[PDB]
Amino acid sequence: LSTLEAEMAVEKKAVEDQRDADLEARAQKLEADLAELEAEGAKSDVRRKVRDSGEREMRQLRDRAQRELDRLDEIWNTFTKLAPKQLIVDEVLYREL
What we know:
Blueprint: H1 2-39, H2 44-80, H3 93-96
């Protein structure tokens, strides 16, 4: 259980490090783009719709990262509490187990 939890935590961290690194890159991109939006006189609405579209693409990035964190926690929980007669219906979870 020790080495397994250790390897699981490191993996779950590698996923978090990625999410953070990726989300800062997309934000810096939006800053560089909103800079060009004010460089050339742009309608206040046009400037904000680019932010809305940018804010929404960020939520997608964090959500997709959250889904993998939950799937990983589902694997570890299922395995530690694992007991005979338990029923597994995922089959993609089962394959990973």
